[PDB]
């Protein structure tokens, strides 16, 4: 029972921290504005419907 | 004298208009915010001294 519980608790807790991560779609246009790039840029994805 | 006031007139309408538009200085790096670049650009001058 003590396994069964843990197998448990990583399923809901993996599934927790990509919820909080990521989300549950993906967008076609990602919009970034990090350093060493200027104020503000716009990258497109690879295949943002089939994943 | 009515010639003497009236290119001083022009004179100062175009040293108004010149302080309106441009300023007195050329700095070295521009910001583009127009239709058709994505949101904001910077463009570098040439010469930005010599003039």
């Given at each position: 029972?003590?396994?069964?519980?843990?197998?448990?608790?990583?399923?809901?807790?993996?599934?927790?921290?990509?919820?909080?991560?990521?989300?549950?779609s993906?967008?076609?246009?990602?919009?970034?504005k990090?350093?060493?790039c200027?104020?503000?840029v716009?990258?497109?994805?690879?295949?943002?419907?089939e994943?």
């Amino acid at each position: 029972i003590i396994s069964i519980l843990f197998k448990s608790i990583f399923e809901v807790a993996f599934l927790l921290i990509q919820w909080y991560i990521y989300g549950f779609s993906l967008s076609a246009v990602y919009t970034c504005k990090r350093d060493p790039c200027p104020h503000q840029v716009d990258c497109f994805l690879s295949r943002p419907t089939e994943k």
